[PDB]
Design a binder for this molecule. Sequence first.
Ligand SMILES: Nc1nc2c(ncn2[C@@H]2O[C@H](COP(=O)(O)O)[C@@H](O)[C@H]2O)c(=O)[nH]1
Ligand SMILES: Nc1nc2c(ncn2[C@@H]2O[C@H](COP(=O)(O)O)[C@@H](O)[C@H]2O)c(=O)[nH]1
Lengths: 394, 394
Amino acid sequence: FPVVLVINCGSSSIKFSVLDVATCDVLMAGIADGMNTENAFLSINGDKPINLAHSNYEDALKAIAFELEKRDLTDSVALIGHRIAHGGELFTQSVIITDEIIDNIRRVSPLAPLHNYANLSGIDAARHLFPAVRQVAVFDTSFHQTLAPEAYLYGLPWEYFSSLGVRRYGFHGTSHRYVSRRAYELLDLDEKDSGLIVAHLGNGASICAVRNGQSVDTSMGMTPLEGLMMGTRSGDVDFGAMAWIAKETGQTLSDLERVVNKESGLLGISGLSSDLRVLEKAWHEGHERARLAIKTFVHRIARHIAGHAASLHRLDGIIFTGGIGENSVLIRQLVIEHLGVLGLTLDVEMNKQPNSHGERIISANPSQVICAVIPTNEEKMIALDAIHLGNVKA
Amino acid sequence: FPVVLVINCGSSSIKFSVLDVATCDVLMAGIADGMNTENAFLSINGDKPINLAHSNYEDALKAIAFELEKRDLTDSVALIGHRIAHGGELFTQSVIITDEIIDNIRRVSPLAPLHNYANLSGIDAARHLFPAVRQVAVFDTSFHQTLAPEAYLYGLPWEYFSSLGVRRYGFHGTSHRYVSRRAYELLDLDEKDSGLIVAHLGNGASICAVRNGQSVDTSMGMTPLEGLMMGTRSGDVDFGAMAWIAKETGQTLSDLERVVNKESGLLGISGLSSDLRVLEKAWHEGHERARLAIKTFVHRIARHIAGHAASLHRLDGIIFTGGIGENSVLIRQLVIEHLGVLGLTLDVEMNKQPNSHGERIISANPSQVICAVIPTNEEKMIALDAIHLGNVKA
Ligand SMILES: Nc1nc2c(ncn2[C@@H]2O[C@H](COP(=O)(O)O)[C@@H](O)[C@H]2O)c(=O)[nH]1
Ligand SMILES: Nc1nc2c(ncn2[C@@H]2O[C@H](COP(=O)(O)O)[C@@H](O)[C@H]2O)c(=O)[nH]1
């Protein structure tokens, strides 16, 4: 009864999951949170908060690995999937990890210094602890390499693209990929004759146009800072204004990189929370700055959704996913309210239902376009890729 | 037989026109080009290139004023209109120039140091040379103050908006205003029940959503650097990428402000020209970089047009204007080609015709939305405002 191990090595954390090959069901989940710090803890299911003080990426994985042998799971780890943040232009699909892969990942790491270099430390540690186990590298950017130049190029001088590698890459590729695959079934569509818009909304957020199967436009840019206004992230911002602010407050480019990435967004406007559950309540309690933060949020999502639709020959569906998209009744309706121009009519009884109802249509009959919610499973997709790559003979 | 004098004091030039009150027709046009330099010339109609060596904003206007008395026009200058670049949040409409106005213009000048401070020098000089003549200040930003916060706020911290005044303002307001007014007549619409998209495309470029008469969304931001990719201007650009480039080439914020504003855009990609007539030919001659520069241009216009439509309850028309929009057959069709999602069908015989045909529908019957071209007249609108403000008793 074989399983697949899934690893995501963030900036300050290691998120892991164990899935069954037969069912693709989670049999264990956990997190090694607060990495590299004076005190680092491991938490499986949120039941054991085992401390490890000053421990790094390798030492954590060793602790996690023990907690699998402790539960007699070591001998069943058939495959190991690794979430990779930035694949650049070198990775179009999912691959079996080899020296060539590690080497190519090292090459593109310049594009995302924080995330990528942690992923490599997660690969190397897994390479170590699991020898005969075939490993797979899954890229958050690969789904997007189907974009045309006219859609990925920036309005900057060519030198930057050809020499320095400056271009739009877009993120949440695995989420946008999975969600769209599922969307073909639920909406009874033809992948080769389809036009979808996928709104991944949560911690970080992006839109993606999926034409006839492939990604043809996405909101996030070279970094995850472009597109929609997000939790702590500003979203689209006038560079002439950023350069102006630099001249006023005397702040540096590095200073503003922090403000834009960590102090801006939903938090930035509200001066309250980078979280909807709070802000949604704050509005109802009469807070205006929070009401604006959400109206502004909603507005920028509708602008991009409708804008991304221009990359499709015909619009068939609009899909919500991520923490916010799946769970938030209000933002869903507010975003449709805004996109009445496309002849969208929402079925409020269908939109009322929580995330327990899973995959669900939320639009009515008169509506020109079908709306739906599909819970993303970044983990399931990583597994499926590896299970497929398991049949491969290297 | 009264006339109106129109003045536009750019960074390095003074563009002027003389219009008849009865007909709103141009009776004289000219330019004082290459200002403040070692040699500064004046050119009426392009017939006399009178040099003035080292001459400033006041001395040029004196020379222009003589060339009106020389043609017996001084005694007929009933009104003087002044193009003002940046009105901030203080000016919602056109006004008669008074001390209070000059004072308020001084207050908002921080938002556009280059343009605004030249406009004031144009007002002061005209104040001088014409005493009893009533003067009018017309703002390139005023039409846009009808925007909701959710549409003008940036994803930055609130402090910047409330204290520092950071927000979207949008430009080409007079062009977007005039064009839309005309569009109601040509398309037989009801201003109070209308939804237009106006694409001003030329030197600099912007889109504007006009719902039930008023501006509800525009592409340009606080500065004229946001929105579409333009001639020398980059357009929308990932700030995470600009901060990344800063870390690579070691360039400063001021360095990049120049690259983005002057070295980027159509010129930036092509490495050839900041002008379409050339690039349109280059493509046909087999140049790829120019072909991309235009495909990229087209694409970013369609993204914003469709995106701005989300600010309308219903889409009735799409309007092209400016040097590029009025004159370019190809870009018009390429932009419609891209916006097939909205059910746009273009009548190519109608699109073939040059700018001599003036105001003209270019879409067919099957098309869900009417397309049209309307030649902007920033000057005529400035006059009309002043002629209206001429009836006012101060
Ligand atoms: N309205 C609402 N928002 C939620 C709920 N659960 C999570 N969220 C939002 O989803 C975000 C987390 O996104 P995630 O990391 O899961 O993609 C949080 O900012 C939070 O506000 C819920 O039950 N209701
Ligand atoms: N294709 C084409 N483009 C033109 C023509 N005249 C002007 N343009 C374009 O319009 C731009 C000038 O915009 P303007 O300053 O008039 O708003 C130039 O970049 C130029 O390429 C024309 O006859 N054909």
